[PDB]
Design a protein around this ligand. Sequence first.
Ligand code: C2E
Ligand code: C2E
Lengths: 273, 119
Amino acid sequence: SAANADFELFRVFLEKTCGIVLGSNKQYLVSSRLNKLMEQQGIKSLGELVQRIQTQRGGLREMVVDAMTTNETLWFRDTYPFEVLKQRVLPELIKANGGQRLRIWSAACSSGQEPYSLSMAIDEFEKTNLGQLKAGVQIVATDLSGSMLTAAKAGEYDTLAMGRGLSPERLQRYFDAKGPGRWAVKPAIRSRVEFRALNLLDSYASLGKFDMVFCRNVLIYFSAEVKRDILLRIHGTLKPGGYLFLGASEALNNLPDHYQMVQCSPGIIYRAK
Amino acid sequence: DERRRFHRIAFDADSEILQGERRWEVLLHDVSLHGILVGQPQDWNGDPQRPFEARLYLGLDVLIRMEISLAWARDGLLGFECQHIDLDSISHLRRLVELNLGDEELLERELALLVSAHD
Ligand SMILES: Nc1nc2c(ncn2[C@@H]2O[C@@H]3COP(=O)(O)O[C@H]4[C@@H](O)[C@H](n5cnc6c(=O)[nH]c(N)nc65)O[C@@H]4COP(=O)(O)O[C@H]3[C@H]2O)c(=O)[nH]1
Ligand SMILES: Nc1nc2c(ncn2[C@@H]2O[C@@H]3COP(=O)(O)O[C@H]4[C@@H](O)[C@H](n5cnc6c(=O)[nH]c(N)nc65)O[C@@H]4COP(=O)(O)O[C@H]3[C@H]2O)c(=O)[nH]1
């Protein structure tokens, strides 16, 4: 009774202040996205947050909008790309450099589901291929400094983030329960991922060279010209023969002398020429 | 000096303007956290007194949908101010602005101005 009314005031607040239209059956999404902010502010209920917002202000309204408009990332998004990674790409790159250190770039990693998905995939490949990766595989994940990047580094996720895309097998193998409704990636998964504050419009020179670059569902946020520049400069970080991953419904449709499209049965990847 | 609260980003995704039963394909010029600029279409029957709806088609997965009002028209251009926007659309729009601003302080300041627009 009382909790539902609070959600309705929050809904109204979003509409009357920012013009944001929430919609219904987003109560659970709201609670998830506001959770850390509320803990930091000592706010124990949605209703308490609403009253606190309109009276104190002082940057709190901006913090709620920041948290509320931060989009979630999915675990192992599209599934097939990580399978192509383990059963096609890793075996090829490994067979090509003698087991040297492989490096993977997860660009615009957001809250971290992608880099951690890659880490888990690497771990699964290694358990069946002991000794192939002599130097192991380094994962570098980048995004803008901010709330998302901070949460990703911590590697903890709530019920909503774990109840989709993550198998029961993977939940036990790679995560540790951290109180009610909260899980954290095990050290083994965490320590192969290095997070760096770096935006796609910043230079990539400090990142070094990669055998694989994951830049999925993010290029859509740039004009045609800016996208082409990003793709060109990404090419500069790739070792020749290295691969770029774009995401299920994105095509490159450009730069034929820099990138060769390749069909992987399920999927497409781009080899750096 | 600067009267613009939100930085306007050069952007050229496939775009539509809607009003009631009419739709126009428009050429997008720029986009911001709180509006857009588009080329005036050839069959512009638009009623500036009533609300419009814009749809920005960034990719197969991502659609930014917003209710807009015409703020000005000059030299074959149309300036629109964002009114109502659903949670999903404003999240994609914020991500676009974020990635293109590349500065957390600049983003924070724009979000602050979004909230205080109706103070
Ligand atoms: N009501 C309204 N009308 C708008 C708005 N933005 C553009 N217009 C109209 O479009 C014309 C072109 O603006 P511009 O191309 O950016 O070219 C502008 C712009 O480069 C610059 N400028 C003028 N005022 C400002 C400002 O307040 N802030 C910034 N950053 N630039 C300005 O001077 C040029 C000519 O200024 P305008 O004569 O005013 O001519 C402007 C104005 O008639 C808006 O947000 N609200
Ligand atoms: N991306 C994009 N967004 C647009 C455009 N035109 C309007 N908007 C959005 O609609 C809001 C209302 O602008 P306004 O009523 O004309 O009221 C404007 C206008 O009175 C004035 N102004 C700003 N720029 C100009 C300009 O270039 N020329 C003139 N004459 N006035 C301007 O400042 C006020 C507030 O500016 P904003 O904070 O930027 O807030 C603008 C902006 O968020 C556009 O062409 N592209």
